[PDB]
Design a protein around this ligand. Structure first.
Ligand SMILES: O=C(O)CCCCCOc1ccccc1CN(C(=O)c1ccc(-c2ccco2)cc1)C1CC1
Ligand SMILES: CCCCCCCO[C@@H]1O[C@H](CO)[C@@H](O)[C@H](O)[C@H]1O
Ligand SMILES: CCCCCCCO[C@@H]1O[C@H](CO)[C@@H](O)[C@H](O)[C@H]1O
Length: 263
């Protein structure tokens, strides 16, 4: 059964191309200046942030710059949760699950997927925003006051290392599918069914990497380790979010994100 994993992989890639607004392909063309005549507007301080909000690029009541950026981060994660939900639903084996198990997988998997996909719009100097029309510098995000700068920097560190693996969109489609269809999530109802789906995806991933990266040694075990790394990254992220909820009482959290962090 070699030709069915290809079709299984092909369905997942099509679900990926069908549902995500930004591909790594498009992201990398922009970040390297080959995308178009127009380059992204660089946000590196308060003035350029204001100019970007004023129209050159682009919420709850305004509070301060660091909280405003945080709100922008929430806008992007919520929208990526939407895309991941439709991505997962475009996978027949995911849609076959009972709706409550679908929610459990997304609840505990979306942030791991978000921070994996985030690497696609990141370089060591910053990341793309607003569909690639802007670029926020890493230095500017580091300059935000704690705890908001603390919750951002670890994702850049993971991203730069992840990008060294040089995955393409067909690799990431399978990788993200494996994150969402994870049998370890708490409160899962049909654990054996999810684990069986996960296993098929991981077989399809290995097969796909052998075909797509023939000279890439150890790439499949490396990606399994990155899946474990994302669990730790998201664990640390949830802890920092708990601290924001305790100490930044004037900062609003989107209702959907509140439900994800309900525990
Ligand atoms: O837990 C939650 O769901 C909500 C809390 C997330 C807090 C952490 O968010 C981080 C961390 C590191 C890197 C990127 C993001 C957010 N982000 C962005 O695309 C993004 C980043 C910066 C800006 C921006 C606008 C103006 C100046 O900067 C706009 C968008 C991708 C993950 C989604
Ligand atoms: C298939 C449609 C009907 C499904 C009805 C089953 C609802 O179960 C609920 O699923 C939620 C996770 O999704 C959990 O958070 C709740 O604890 C649990 O009670
Ligand atoms: C839309 C995809 C993203 C889903 C976001 C996660 C939703 O949170 C969970 O929704 C369940 C109701 O179904 C509740 O039982 C849980 O208490 C709650 O934690």
């Amino acid at each position: 059964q070699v030709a069915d994993l290809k079709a299984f992989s092909k369905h997942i890639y099509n679900a990926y191309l069908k549902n995500f607004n930004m591909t790594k392909k498009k992201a990398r063309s922009i970040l390297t200046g080959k995308a178009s005549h127009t380059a992204p507007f660089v946000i590196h301080d308060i003035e350029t942030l204001w100019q970007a909000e004023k129209g050159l690029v682009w919420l709850p009541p305004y509070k301060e710059i660091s909280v405003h950026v945080f709100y922008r981060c929430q806008c992007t994660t919520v929208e990526t949760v939407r895309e991941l939900t439709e991505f997962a639903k475009s996978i027949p084996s995911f849609s076959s699950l009972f709706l409550n198990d679908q929610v459990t997988l997304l609840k505990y998997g979306v942030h791991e997927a978000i921070f994996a996909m985030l690497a696609s719009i990141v370089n060591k100097d910053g990341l793309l925003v607003a569909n690639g029309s802007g670029f926020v510098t890493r230095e500017f995000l580091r300059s935000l006051r704690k705890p908001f700068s603390d919750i951002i920097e670890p994702k850049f560190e993971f991203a730069v290392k992840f990008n060294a693996l040089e995955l393409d969109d067909s690799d990431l489609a399978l990788f993200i599918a494996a994150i969402i269809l994870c049998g370890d999530r708490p409160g899962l109802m049909n654990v054996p069914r999810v684990e069986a789906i996960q296993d098929t995806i991981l077989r399809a991933l290995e097969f796909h990497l052998q075909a797509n990266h023939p000279d890439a040694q150890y790439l499949f075990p490396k990606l399994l380790q990155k899946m474990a790394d994302l669990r730790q990254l998201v664990t640390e992220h949830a802890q920092m979010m708990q601290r924001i909820k305790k100490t930044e009482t004037e900062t609003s959290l989107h209702p959907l994100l509140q439900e994800i962090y309900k525990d």
